[PDB]
Design a protein around this nucleic acid. Structure first.
Lengths: 356, 290, 141, 106, 158, 135, 37, 144, 59, 37
RNA sequence: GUUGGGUUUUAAAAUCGUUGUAAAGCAGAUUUGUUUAUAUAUUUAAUUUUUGUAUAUAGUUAAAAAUUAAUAUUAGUACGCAAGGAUUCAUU
RNA sequence: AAAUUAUAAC
């Protein structure tokens, strides 16, 4: 977590003498370089220069603006100051897309050009669709997007849930989970989501209900050799002398006895995609999950990792709202051996030997 | 470095890139459990608050001078250097990311004052190749005829920024004559007032340029007037420094040598030649005082 | 409790094992092994447990210093067809060292070849005995 | 009922009806501005706007660059997003894999 | 007060991995991180030409495997010849460059491997071998610059 | 071609008894192991550091060099591996006759007439060994 | 043993925990010179 | 990762999921064959009713079967029914085979060498045009 | 954890030095000790005056 | 920097020193500034 | 002055009070505010600028030695499989 | 080469 702090900077130090560009005071009608001069002159405190015209604030600024209208290329990185980016358009530091609901189909093993051997897990993304959007009272950033999966007969769900899919008109889905999207990542209800929504190299987070183990002891749940102290603040004797100490008289919260052992909601938050099969709507991940086959796994993107945004300048940039296909792109025209999109090598070197 | 080809970067130069996804190392990624709610892909926008995003519905926050709700109280600096409508959060809740609803209104950039349009200005190309103290470094970076004082013959608009060098030397950078007037009859009145003028002479005769330091004169007025200094510059103008009650030699040298930089940059604006100070016998013989 | 390990949300506890037939699984792994033999890293095979056992293997195995050229007898044939499972479990008797080993049979750098002329099953039986002896009599007892 | 837990089984329904009252007390004030003088101070841009912030590029006390990110959302775009159809993805955006191994600035 | 821990020093020189259905060794034959790093006096075979018994060489350190990284172990090893010649002593402490092991160690390419007998070669304090010739087939994991630039890199690897 | 260039390099720095062996196709892993008899520990370090540069401009792959411990220093060119031993320490070990005697490592090596012939082995020591069977 | 320096607790968060052991004639009834959180 | 997140040694549950993976420690008998004799809870098995031992479990199963071949009905209790309807069909998948070994495959199981003939006499002519699930399993509204 | 809770080995507040002996609350939960000046086991850890700095010598 | 930096306001090169004490009613006026005196 | 070696605390526990652990069997939907057994930051090997500095050689960073986890809004006394892993593979 | 281990592993 050390090396995870951004550049520290307070608020009492964002003043005129620190801004990278001309510090701009607000005056109602328009910005300006000088402080607002109070209208009632009786307010003006002693030794407070109500500057009507300063040259240095007006000269340094004058050369600045002229140089940007005349030499755009050199002063490129100073064009977001006065021309801010619009809304939508996939800001990289701000936009969070939505994921989709996949089903664990099977497992296999793949190999890169290098002699490496991966343990692949084919996830099937059957029939995803944005079934509705929701916001907590129109608050900011509290947006959500629910995505159904696996169209099903109406005779399947209970009434009180099928009646919900009979609200937004979408086909009655098998299940639908929700992802917190940014208001720029929205899409109209019903957008048939393709699997190509994901790119074959991004680090994708999944969440699922791992395999149920019933009721196991300690040797299986937390099986260890020895421990259970977390003694912490409670006093104890070292270096005898003034000694009266206290000990435990209750099973402190968070002990480690027997329990359920695993019907919870697991979360892998760094799995990189391996092979997007966009004919069969399959995604392969080079990891084995401890989940029963047939589970539903909600896919997201690892928004950032190791310190760098996922959809940054260098690496690819996603199909932002979603992946909309063409008009003539009929996947049924091509065999499953053509609708494949493999990945770059995940390892820099053959992992039986060492780094050259 | 290289052709940016990520394959031809490893296979050729062996620039091993840090494992990004499948490594066994930490893979620094906070906010995995500590941050409840929508997290934006901006990396560490919540790491000084204690890696949480819970609060900040609240407008008020403990603020030292200049921070959030300190904008009503008066404080000289932030009253001339901070838009009051700009005061944000407190001292550790600094906003590395702020998201608000509502349309965006861009109050236009402020235009320029006292520039009659349709007056094409000549421009100065400032460069670091210049010595950074040359007089061409303090002239305005855009020269308007609206700013050239013509009543006195001046080609370019006068400078607007002055060097911050605390001058403890004197010289004839563009002076022509520095006289002082004192009174030996003066005994009690202004003991220190005389103690400064005479001292400024003893600290003026040690001026800094290859001139004969006898550009300085010392007159004995029997007028019984408080000692007064008169400095006249090459072009002719005279500067009478103010000898107030409680001003010593070290103060005067900063007075004149500032009004002697403006006089130089006024003369350099009037077409007078430039006597550039440089290393001659005084940047030495003062280098030994080390 | 303060922890609630199990979670009974309708999303998690559901199972999509009813509609899997709408996804042709075994039809895919063919079209996924077929891609592997279309690539360099495999050749189609239809062995039958009796057929492979005892048959000699050429190997090669890439690796950085030089390829490992090693000759040995097959003994398992884990898959019996060209599926991605593969597997061989050869014995390979290189030198004074004996080395039973497994070949995933899809690896680019782990390439080999099997031949079926001297792979008479009645030769496999001897190789099986040769290993047990080397196995049992190397226990540092 | 922890103290900090009873303070919120009370104030959370109040914090709701408070801020939603301010938003109402804005439309009255913005509509009053609309009938009032159009081009005036009237406390910033009156018509449901958030004065864009110009001052978000700083050089902190340790002489290094510090950027303040600030984003707004026009209620029209996010409303056009939710009823219109996005654009077709460019063939070069999905056929080019998101490459692993984030290149340095080499 | 609070007998916080006894021996406490095996935990600094052993690879102890809890058994909790997730952390667990396994028999090998599953994937990298095979298991059982061979931690006790195991009486490895010597193979290089010396009077090391070539049938017995008793172990010292409590860890031996490459998924445990024999590539930086400094694995000490004591020589216990049941007979040497009736040139080393039967009582010295040489390092060892482990070659192979009967335990089926799965490689990072699925290539399982197990040999007839776990063997190794004695070497010195500067990581130079003590023999001239080696009579066995070493493992790929002996390719590091750690045990290469003095190791003859005897012959055919695996 | 490349193996001969290493000889036109070392032989300039006054290396003696330089012997190359095309050990390829034989039991070893490298394909051309060479041997050099330099005198001083420094004289072993130069020839080590000298062949590195030749492995920097023509065969640019010059990943690494080591610091010290140059009694018997070894420098590989990957598969053309150059040994540089002191004047001594060669009347001990092979210098030849382990790779100049090793047969061509061909197939059909399945327990020939008792393999305990080892003219490359019996040249240096005895090395008892028992051939096995299903016996 | 010899129970010395009683402590009369008034409430909490309004007694400062140094004034508890106050009301005893000593060097207490002053301000703790170096407090720990 | 490369090793499954759970090793070989871990018991899943009753009514668990399949959770497919590679493993090499199964198939004790000629599994899936008309006399598999495997008994457990995970679906690929027969429900292990309460018997005093695995051997005594077979003896129960044998004498439950050779009472379905005399009286073509039976009133069993608990988990003997599912593991008899399953075994009642195995006998009939074994009747149509009729090879010289089936009757020696079925003479080993039943405590009766007569019923084997009746089994092999009726069931071909009787279950010829029925694919599978030859035995009915009606749950009675009563209880012991 | 920002809320904190990293208490020391016991002491809460320590008053001024007053020569060799410096006070301390030693808040924990009780005491027992002794005392060089009059040695009697003295439960009253709420206040223990150490000697120069040796926690061995008290009150 | 060294700590909380406060820059006292500055003027042009020429209007900096010896500003004219020219007022309007109780107000220091100048072409550039205004300040109650 | 006679004089001093000892330092430590138990052997069948239906838990039977609190305790914590798990749980009340399908919720379309983690997470405005509770509460954090959550736990390490480094002993190694091999490189990349053995170059800075000194007569010998740093200092940074990366590859390798192992498993990731989210609580409470819906009708109930069979097997949560009609079981031999297919939500009836053909009818009886 | 033996009947044993420990095994608190299916």
């Amino acid at each position: 977590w050390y090396r995870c702090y951004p550049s520290l900077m307070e608020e009492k130090d964002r003043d005129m003498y620190h801004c990278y560009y001309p510090y701009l005071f607000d005056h109602g009608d328009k910005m300006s370089l000088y402080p607002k001069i109070p209208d009632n002159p009786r307010e003006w405190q002693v030794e407070q220069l109500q500057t009507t015209y300063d040259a240095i604030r007006e000269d340094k600024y004058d050369a600045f603006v002229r140089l940007r209208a005349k030499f755009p290329e050199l002063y490129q990185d100073t064009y977001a100051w006065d021309n801010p980016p619009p809304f939508g358009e996939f800001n990289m530091f701000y936009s969070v897309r939505f994921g989709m609901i996949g089903v664990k189909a099977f497992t296999c093993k793949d190999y890169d050009d290098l002699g490496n051997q991966f343990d692949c897990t084919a996830f099937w993304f059957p029939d995803n669709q944005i079934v509705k959007h929701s916001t907590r009272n129109g608050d900011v950033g509290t947006d959500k997007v629910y995505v159904g999966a696996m169209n099903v007969p109406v005779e399947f769900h209970k009434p009180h849930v099928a009646a919900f899919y009979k609200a937004a008109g979408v086909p009655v889905k098998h299940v639908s989970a929700g992802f917190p999207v940014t208001p720029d990542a929205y899409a109209p209800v019903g957008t048939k989501l393709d699997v190509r929504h994901f790119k074959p190299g991004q680090e994708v987070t999944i969440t699922f209900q791992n395999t149920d183990y019933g009721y196991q002891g300690v040797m299986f749940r937390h099986g260890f050799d020895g421990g259970y102290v977390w003694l912490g603040d409670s006093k104890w004797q070292r270096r005898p002398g003034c000694m009266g100490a206290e000990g435990q008289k209750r099973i402190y919260p968070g002990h480690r006895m027997a329990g359920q052992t695993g019907a919870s909601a697991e979360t892998y938050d760094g799995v990189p995609v391996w092979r997007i099969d966009y004919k069969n709507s399959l995604i392969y991940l080079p990891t084995l999950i401890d989940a029963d086959v047939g589970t539903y796994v909600k896919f997201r993107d690892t928004i950032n990792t190791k310190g760098y945004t996922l959809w940054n300048e260098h690496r690819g940039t996603p199909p932002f709202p979603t992946f909309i296909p063409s008009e003539e792109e009929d996947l049924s025209k091509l065999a499953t051996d053509e609708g494949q999109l493999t990945s770059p090598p995940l390892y820099m070197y053959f992992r039986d030997e060492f780094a050259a | 470095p290289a052709s940016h080809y990520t394959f031809a970067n490893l296979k050729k130069l062996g620039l091993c890139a840090p494992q990004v996804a499948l490594s066994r190392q930490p893979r620094l990624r906070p906010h995995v459990g500590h941050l409840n709610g929508l997290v934006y892909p901006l990396p560490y926008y919540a790491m000084w608050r204690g890696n949480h995003d819970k609060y900040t519905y609240n407008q008020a926050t403990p603020a030292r001078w200049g921070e959030g709700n300190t904008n009503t109280m008066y404080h000289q600096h932030y009253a001339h250097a901070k838009c009051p409508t700009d005061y944000g959060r407190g001292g550790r809740e600094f906003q590395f990311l702020s998201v608000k609803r509502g349309k965006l209104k861009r109050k236009p950039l402020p235009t320029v004052q006292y520039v009659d349009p349709n007056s094409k200005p000549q421009w100065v190309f400032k460069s670091w190749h210049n010595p950074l103290s040359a007089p061409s470094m303090w002239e305005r970076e855009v020269q308007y005829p609206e700013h050239t004082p013509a009543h006195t013959g001046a080609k370019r608009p006068l400078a607007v920024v002055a060097p911050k060098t605390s001058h403890k030397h004197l010289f004839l950078m563009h002076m022509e004559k520095v006289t002082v007037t004192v009174s030996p009859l003066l005994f009690g009145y202004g003991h220190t007032l005389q103690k400064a003028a005479l001292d400024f002479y003893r600290r003026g005769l040690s001026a800094r340029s290859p001139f004969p330091s006898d550009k300085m004169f010392l007159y004995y007025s029997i007028d019984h007037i408080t000692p007064k200094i008169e400095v006249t510059w090459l072009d002719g103008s005279v500067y009478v420094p103010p000898l107030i009650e409680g001003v010593k030699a070290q103060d005067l040298i900063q007075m004149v040598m500032e009004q002697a930089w403006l006089a130089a940059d006024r003369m350099s604006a009037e077409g007078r030649v430039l006597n550039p100070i440089a290393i001659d016998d005084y940047k030495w013989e003062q280098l030994i005082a080390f | 409790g303060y922890t609630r390990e199990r979670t009974n949300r309708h999303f998690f506890v559901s199972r999509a094992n009813a509609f899997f037939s709408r996804l042709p699984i075994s039809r895919i792994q063919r079209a996924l092994a077929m891609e592997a033999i279309k690539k360099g890293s495999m050749k189609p095979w239809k062995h039958t447990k009796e057929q492979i056992i005892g048959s000699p293997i050429t190997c090669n195995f890439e690796y950085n210093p030089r390829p490992v050229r090693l000759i040995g007898t097959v003994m398992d044939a884990h898959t019996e067809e060209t599926s991605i499972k593969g597997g061989l479990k050869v014995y390979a008797r290189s030198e004074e060292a004996n080395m039973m080993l497994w070949i995933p049979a899809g690896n680019p750098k782990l390439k080999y070849e099997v031949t079926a002329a001297k792979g008479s099953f009645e030769h496999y039986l001897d190789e099986r005995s040769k290993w047990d002896e080397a196995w049992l009599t190397g226990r540092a007892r | 009922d922890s103290f900090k837990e009873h303070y919120h089984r009370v104030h959370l329904p109040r914090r709701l009806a408070l801020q939603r009252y301010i938003k109402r007390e804005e439309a009255r004030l913005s509509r009053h501005k609309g009938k009032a003088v159009a081009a005036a101070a009237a406390a910033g841009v009156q018509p449901g706007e958030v004065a864009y912030k110009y001052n978000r590029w700083w050089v902190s006390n340790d002489h290094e660059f510090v950027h303040q990110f600030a984003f707004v959302e026009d209620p029209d775009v996010t409303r056009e997003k939710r009823n219109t159809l996005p654009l077709v993805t460019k063939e070069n955006i999905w056929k080019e894999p998101q490459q692993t191994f984030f290149l340095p600035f080499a | 007060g609070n007998p916080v821990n006894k021996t406490w020093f095996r935990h600094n020189l052993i690879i102890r991995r809890k058994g909790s259905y997730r952390s667990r060794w396994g028999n090998g034959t599953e994937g990298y991180g095979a298991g059982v790093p061979l931690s006790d006096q195991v009486k490895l075979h010597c193979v290089d030409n010396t009077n090391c018994k070539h049938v017995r060489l008793i172990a010292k350190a409590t860890a031996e495997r490459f998924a445990h990284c024999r590539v930086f172990p400094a694995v000490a090893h004591r020589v216990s010849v049941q007979r040497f010649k009736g040139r080393v002593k039967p009582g010295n402490i040489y390092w060892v460059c482990l070659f192979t092991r009967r335990q089926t160690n799965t490689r990072m390419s699925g290539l399982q491997t197990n040999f007839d007998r776990n063997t190794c070669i004695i070497m010195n304090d500067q990581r130079v071998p003590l023999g001239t010739r080696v009579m066995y087939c070493a493992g790929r994991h002996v390719n590091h610059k750690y045990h290469l630039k003095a190791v003859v890199l005897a012959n055919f690897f695996v | 071609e490349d193996v001969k260039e290493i000889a036109n390099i070392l032989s300039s720095l006054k290396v003696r008894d330089l012997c190359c062996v095309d050990v390829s196709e034989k039991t070893s892993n490298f394909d051309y192991m060479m041997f050099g008899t330099c005198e001083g520990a420094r004289h072993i370090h130069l020839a080590a550091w000298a062949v590195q540069d030749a492995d920097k401009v023509h065969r640019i792959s010059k990943i690494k060099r080591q610091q010290t411990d140059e009694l018997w220093e070894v420098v590989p060119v990957g598969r053309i591996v150059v040994n540089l031993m002191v004047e001594s320490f060669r009347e001990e070990m092979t210098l030849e006759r382990k790779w100049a005697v090793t047969r061509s490592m061909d197939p059909l090596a399945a327990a020939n007439a008792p393999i305990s012939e080892g003219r490359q082995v019996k040249a240096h020591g005895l090395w008892t060994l028992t051939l096995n069977l299903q016996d | 043993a010899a129970a010395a320096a009683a402590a009369a607790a008034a409430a909490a968060a309004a007694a400062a925990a140094a004034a508890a052991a106050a009301a005893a004639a000593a060097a207490a009834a002053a301000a703790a010179a170096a407090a720990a959180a | 990762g490369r090793p499954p997140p759970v090793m070989g040694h871990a018991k899943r549950m009753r009514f668990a999921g399949v959770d497919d993976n590679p493993s090499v420690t199964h198939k004790p008998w000629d599994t899936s064959e008309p006399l598999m004799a495997d008994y457990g809870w995970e679906r690929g098995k027969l429900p292990k009713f309460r018997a005093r031992s695995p051997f005594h479990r077979q003896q129960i199963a044998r004498r439950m079967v050779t009472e379905l071949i005399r009286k073509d009905y039976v009133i069993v209790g608990g988990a003997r029914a599912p593991a008899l309807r399953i075994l009642a069909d195995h006998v009939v998948e074994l009747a149509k085979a009729g090879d010289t070994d089936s009757r020696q495959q079925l003479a080993y199981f039943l405590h009766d060498p007569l019923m084997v003939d009746k089994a092999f006499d009726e069931y071909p002519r009787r279950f010829r045009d029925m694919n599978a699930k030859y035995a009915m399993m009606t749950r009675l509204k009563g209880r012991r | 954890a920002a809320a904190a809770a990293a208490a020391a080995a016991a002491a809460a507040a320590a008053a001024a030095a007053a020569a060799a002996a410096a006070a301390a609350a030693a808040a924990a939960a009780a005491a027992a000790a002794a005392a060089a000046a009059a040695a009697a086991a003295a439960a009253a850890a709420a206040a223990a005056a150490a000697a120069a700095a040796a926690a061995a010598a008290a009150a | 920097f060294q700590s909380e930096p406060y820059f006292e306001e500055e003027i042009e090169a020429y209007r900096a020193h010896h500003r004219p004490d020219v007022y309007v009613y109780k107000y220091n006026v100048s072409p550039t500034h205004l300040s109650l005196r």
